[PDB]
Amino acid sequence: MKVILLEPLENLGDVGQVVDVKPGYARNYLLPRGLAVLATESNLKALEARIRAQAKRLAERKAEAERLKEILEN
RNA sequence: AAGGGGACCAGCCUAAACCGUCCGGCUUGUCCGGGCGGGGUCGUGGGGCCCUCGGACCGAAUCCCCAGCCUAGCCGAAG
Ligand SMILES: [Mg+2]
Ligand SMILES: [Mg+2]
Ligand SMILES: [Mg+2]
Ligand SMILES: [Mg+2]
Numbered sequence: 001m002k003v004i005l006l007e008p009l010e011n012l013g014d015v016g017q018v019v020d021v022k023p024g025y026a027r028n029y030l031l032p033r034g035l036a037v038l039a040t041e042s043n044l045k046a047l048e049a050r051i052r053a054q055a056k057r058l059a060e061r062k063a064e065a066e067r068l069k070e071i072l073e074n
Numbered sequence: 075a076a077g078g079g080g081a082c083c084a085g086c087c088u089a090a091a092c093c094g095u096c097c098g099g100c101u102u103g104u105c106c107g108g109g110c111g112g113g114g115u116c117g118u119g120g121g122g123c124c125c126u127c128g129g130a131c132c133g134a135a136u137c138c139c140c141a142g143c144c145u146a147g148c149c150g151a152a153g
């Protein structure tokens with residue numbers, strides 16, 4: 001069963017990473033402890049959108065700086 | 075059972091793509107989800123979306139009116 005981790009987790013994977021676990025583990029541990037979510041299409045979309053949104057605001061800052069290197073350094 | 079002879083005869087509505095709107099969620103949007111509306115309905119495959127060209131007839135199984143019909147009757151030849 002594929003899940004999306006909601007947290008870093010000892011020798012399983014890192015937050016936002018998609019891993020394969022035995023359904024028992026997902027259903028009766030990971031999901032109830034809020035540690036992961038089902039890799040459904042409907043929330044794979046959402047993860048894609050989060051990676052999307054973070055990467056927008058990262059490079060947007062790495063411009064607000066780079067462009068501020070232009071106003072200074074000259 | 076197919077086929078043949080007959081009876082009767084009639085075909086439609088959706089889901090999904092996509093568009094719009096309301097509402098809810100937290101992991102804040104190019105988000106996910108629920109409702110509603112739009113769109114769509116097919117096997118020569120059909121639809122969606124993006125270009126190009128083109129721009130009144132049919133019509134209910136719903137509704138309304140009516141004929142007809144039922145629920146009482148009546149006239150009815152000549153010792
Ligand atoms: Mg057989
Ligand atoms: Mg027959
Ligand atoms: Mg026949
Ligand atoms: Mg008959």
Ligand SMILES: [Mg+2]
Nearest residue numbers: 106107108109
């Ligand atoms: Mg929805």
Ligand SMILES: [Mg+2]
Nearest residue numbers: 095106107108
């Ligand atoms: Mg929506």
Ligand SMILES: [Mg+2]
Nearest residue numbers: 095108109110
């Ligand atoms: Mg909706």
Ligand SMILES: [Mg+2]
Nearest residue numbers: 119120121122
């Ligand atoms: Mg086609």
Ligand SMILES: [Mg+2]
Nearest residue numbers: 086134135136
């Ligand atoms: Mg009809």
Ligand SMILES: [Mg+2]
Nearest residue numbers: 148149150151
């Ligand atoms: Mg009499």
Ligand SMILES: [Mg+2]
Nearest residue numbers: 149150151152
């Ligand atoms: Mg008499």
